[PDB]
């Protein structure tokens, strides 16, 4: 009962069976389900010669509603995924609990954060967006340079921060804006805007049929008194991000340039909120993520085109009532 993997793990329908074990909580919301599903085990170091170490990292973000269930989405991640720590918004001043090393004070206890304390894993945030700007400063390298570097003690040593990042914040403006622009929805400074990722949002409008469907599901959920189990896929992802080490090959990597141009030409000063050369490479992260969801190690148009599917949906998500830019632009792509 160990080939539990390879009695099943190679079917074509298993693109979506992973979604059924994210959080068995929500009727809707396939998108973030799939996004966290891929990003829980995706990753590649691909250290080229002496330059740098690229990423075992991503920052998916959902800036939704103050009270749509978001903070519950996070916990099953921890209850399956191998590492963590719990932290909520309003952490330290981002310094952390800068010591000088003496046998006075009996060693003047020592640490610098928690990405120092949990690398190549997770450690949790909730309800961030109403926190000290003096932390939104501080965490703003470890995400991408994946490197720490300190001073201001008896020492200037340095240490490794290879991680990813939880998101869990809260919007401003009451609940959530219309399709009117996003930079107006929550106001974070210019040199933080740099990185960005899996852009989803719990925008709400009322359907009574769906209200009936899910509410049946809810009361059914409240009616349990006394495809995948959590019994297994835990180990699938241990295996998947530990042992197999995927790749890429030239198949269609020029198409990426036309779509980046589709950003820059359809989006200049309307929506295109400095989404530089990190999210593009996050394209690759999705593709490599997909093939490790397959234990493939290479791929054809499939995985990359799935990345294009999801991104095409999202960037239509976060526009104006004029909401169909890449939609009209990609019926030919689609």
């Amino acid at each position: 009962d160990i080939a539990t993997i390879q009695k099943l793990s190679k079917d074509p329908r298993i693109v979506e069976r992973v979604v059924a074990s994210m959080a068995p909580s929500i009727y809707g919301h396939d998108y973030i389900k799939r996004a966290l599903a891929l990003a829980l085990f995706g990753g590649e170091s691909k250290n080229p010669g002496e330059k740098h170490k690229v990423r075992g990292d991503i920052n998916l973000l959902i800036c939704g509603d103050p009270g749509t269930a978001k903070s519950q989405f996070l916990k099953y991640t921890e209850k399956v995924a191998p590492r963590a720590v719990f932290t909520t918004g309003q952490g330290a001043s981002a310094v952390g609990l800068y010591v000088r090393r003496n046998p006075v004070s009996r060693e003047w206890t020592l640490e610098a954060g928690a990405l120092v304390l949990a690398d190549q894993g997770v450690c949790l945030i909730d309800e961030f967006d109403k926190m000290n700007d003096q932390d939104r400063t501080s965490i703003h390298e470890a995400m991408e340079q994946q490197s720490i570097s300190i001073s201001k003690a008896g020492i200037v040593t340095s240490l490794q921060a290879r991680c990813t990042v939880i998101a869990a914040a809260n919007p401003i403006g009451g609940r959530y804006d219309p399709s009117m622009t996003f930079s107006e929805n929550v106001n974070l400074s210019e040199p933080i805007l740099s990185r960005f990722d899996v852009l989803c949002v719990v925008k709400d409008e009322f359907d009574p049929m769906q209200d009936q469907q899910l509410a049946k599901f809810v009361v059914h959920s409240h009616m349990k008194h006394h495809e995948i189990p959590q019994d297994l896929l835990r180990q699938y992802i241990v295996y998947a991000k530990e042992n197999i080490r995927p790749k890429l090959t030239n198949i269609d990597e020029d198409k990426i340039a036309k779509m980046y141009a589709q950003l820059r030409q359809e989006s200049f000063a309307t929506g295109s909120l400095p989404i530089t050369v990190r999210h593009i490479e996050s394209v690759i992260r999705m593709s490599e993520a997909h093939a490790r969801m397959h234990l493939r190690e290479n791929v054809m148009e499939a995985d990359v085109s799935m990345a294009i599917r999801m991104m095409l949906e999202s960037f239509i998500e976060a526009q104006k009532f004029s909401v169909m830019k890449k939609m009209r632009s990609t019926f030919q792509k689609y």
Partner: protein, 620 residues
């Protein structure tokens, strides 16, 4: 002397003694006699050795050498002096007196890791590779001495018991018992002692943890050998200082059973060759190297080739990069008999839209002789501690670790101003001052600095006028070449960035077809090249350069003032003495590269066009 095995004599008797007389190849080089004698001639008192010569000689010693090296490696010393003192005789008349010597060891076996230096790996020879932090001063140690009580040079195996009987007993029956020992250091000796240090690697279980480290030891010639912040290859040995298991349990509530302490002593440190792993202070470089150097300096196609050395995976920013390396060489510390030590090293600014590879670039400028990187929230008040042994107030004082190196930082914007001012100042006079506790030691050190930043409001500030910095213009003062970073659009630029990095980002791509580019090679070479070229040439101007540069700065200030008047309000950067005082250092960097001492103004029209970027940046 139990002549059965492990004997005191057999080794020294002939074996080690004759190994070297016997060590032979024609060409009549291949001994260690020549090296020994010619070392002696210049006061060296050592020589270098392998550990896989025994395979060249035998099959027994080495698997006995590893076991009790502490003895074998002094039998080596004795054999060394007796086999060399025969040659100290030109005839019997010019050994005025013999002398003591130190042996070395080396190999290419394999480096280990600190996580395994364990109870099995003890009293045993080894190899590792770590990095250096700091280590002590130079205290003392010796080997033997006499005492008036007995008048015998007190001979020891270990590097203390002092028994009862008097030995000034020839006093009649009125003897002097109870240990009356008068140490006679007229009759003692003296060797060195330095306590080297060792941190572990940056990839070998620091991951879910922190890195540990280790402290060290030396005797005679490996002081003045290692400056800290360096990458070592090592052969040492893992041994203790104290001893005991039974219920004499230590201290007050210490030592459940038997815990004694670690350390290592060195038997044959060497260094690293990460390209040029260890090329920082000494010179084992050879005439071929220097020919190579000067003949590339002779090459008049070296600078533009060097514009393409940091960006083999990066596109663009070439006018930006015509002086990103000129920072490294430094100009001239043209000091004068009065105070005016006009500013030696060089400093740079850069700031603009993210997504433009500032972090990786500064990581690389660290990569390519000596440097460090933190950024904000925190290298270096300077540090006045208080010694937990004896409680004295010593000064660790860490721009000291750029005492000729350079510095790079971003995150000047994102750290508060309680700690900017000592460093606001250092980089105009290079003298770290101190006045805090009972000490007035105006320290100093020649560091430069690289300054990246982040403007809040991005290119909005850069479109219209004065929101350039958020903090002050007095550090708009100290820097010469200052660079916007924008990401202005163009689809050609877009696609070209697209494939340019993907062809990078694909399959760990460019191993074979990378270096086949022209001459853009070996940052190792640049470590060596830099540590050379700065260490010799002390140029300064030619006459024809001075007038045109002078008139150019004149017109610079006139144009700044006219933009002040062409807007009826101050539209300028302050036309400082610092601007010329720095462009002089840009000329100096150029002449440092090509090694021609006297530099002409065509050499520096390049400088003119590069700081013109700063001029036309703060033009608005």
């Amino acid at each position: 002397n139990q002549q059965d095995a492990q004997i005191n004599l057999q080794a020294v008797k002939k074996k080690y003694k004759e190994f070297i007389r016997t060590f032979n190849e024609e060409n009549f080089f291949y001994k260690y006699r020549d090296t020994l004698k010619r070392n002696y001639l210049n006061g060296r008192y050592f020589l270098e050795i392998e550990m896989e010569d025994l395979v060249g000689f035998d099959e027994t010693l080495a698997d006995k050498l590893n076991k009790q090296p502490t003895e074998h490696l002094e039998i080596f010393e004795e054999a060394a002096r007796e086999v060399a003192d025969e040659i100290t005789a030109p005839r019997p008349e010019h050994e005025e007196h013999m002398h003591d010597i130190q042996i070395l060891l080396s190999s290419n076996a394999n480096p280990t890791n600190i996580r395994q230096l364990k109870s099995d790996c003890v009293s045993k020879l080894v190899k590792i590779a770590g990095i250096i932090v700091a280590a002590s001063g130079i205290s003392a140690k010796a080997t033997r001495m006499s005492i008036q009580c007995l008048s015998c040079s007190t001979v020891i195996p270990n590097l203390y018991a002092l028994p009862r009987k008097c030995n000034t007993e020839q006093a009649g029956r009125p003897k002097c018992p109870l240990d009356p020992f008068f140490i006679m250091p007229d009759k003692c000796k003296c060797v060195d002692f330095q306590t080297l240090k060792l941190q572990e690697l940056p990839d070998f279980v620091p991951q879910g943890e922190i890195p540990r480290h280790l402290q060290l030891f030396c005797d005679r010639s490996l002081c003045e050998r290692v400056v800290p912040g360096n990458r070592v290859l090592i052969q040492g040995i893992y041994s203790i200082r104290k001893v005991g298991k039974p219920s004499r349990r230590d201290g007050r509530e210490k030592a459940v059973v038997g815990v004694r302490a670690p350390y290592m002593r060195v038997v044959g440190i060497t260094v690293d060759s990460e390209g040029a792993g260890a090329i920082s202070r000494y010179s084992n470089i050879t005439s071929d190297e220097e020919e190579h150097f000067r003949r590339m300096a002779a090459s008049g196609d070296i600078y533009e080739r060097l514009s393409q050395s940091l960006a083999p995976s990066i596109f663009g920013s070439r006018d930006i990069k015509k002086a990103i390396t000129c920072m490294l060489f430094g100009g001239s510390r043209k000091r004068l008999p009065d105070g005016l030590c006009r500013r030696g090293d060089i400093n740079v600014l850069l700031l603009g839209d993210p997504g433009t590879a500032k972090s990786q670039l500064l990581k690389f400028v660290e990569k390519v002789p000596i440097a460090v990187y933190t950024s904000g929230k925190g290298s270096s008040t300077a540090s006045v501690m208080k010694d937990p042994q004896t409680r004295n107030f010593v000064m660790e004082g860490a721009m000291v670790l750029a005492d000729g190196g350079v510095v790079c930082i971003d995150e000047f914007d994102k750290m508060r101003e309680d700690d900017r001012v000592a460093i606001h100042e250092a980089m105009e006079q290079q003298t770290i001052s101190i006045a805090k506790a009972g000490i007035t030691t105006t320290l100093n050190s020649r560091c430069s600095v690289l300054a990246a930043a982040n403007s809040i409001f991005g290119r909005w500030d850069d479109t219209k006028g004065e929101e350039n910095i958020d903090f002050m213009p007095t550090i708009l003062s100290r820097f010469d070449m200052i660079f916007i970073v924008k990401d202005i659009h163009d689809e050609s630029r877009d696609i070209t960035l697209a494939k340019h990095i993907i062809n990078v980002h694909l399959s760990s791509n460019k191993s074979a077809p990378s270096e086949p580019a022209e001459g853009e090679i070996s940052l190792s070479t640049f470590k060596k090249y830099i540590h050379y070229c700065r260490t010799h040439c002390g140029p300064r101007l030619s006459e024809a350069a001075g007038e045109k540069l002078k008139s150019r700065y004149v017109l610079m200030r006139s144009g700044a003032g006219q933009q002040e008047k062409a807007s009826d309000k101050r539209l300028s950067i302050p036309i400082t003495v610092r601007q010329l005082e720095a462009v002089i250092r840009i000329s100096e960097s150029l002449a440092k590269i090509r090694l021609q001492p006297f530099a002409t103004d065509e050499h520096v029209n390049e400088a003119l066009r590069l700081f013109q970027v700063s001029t036309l940046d703060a033009a608005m």
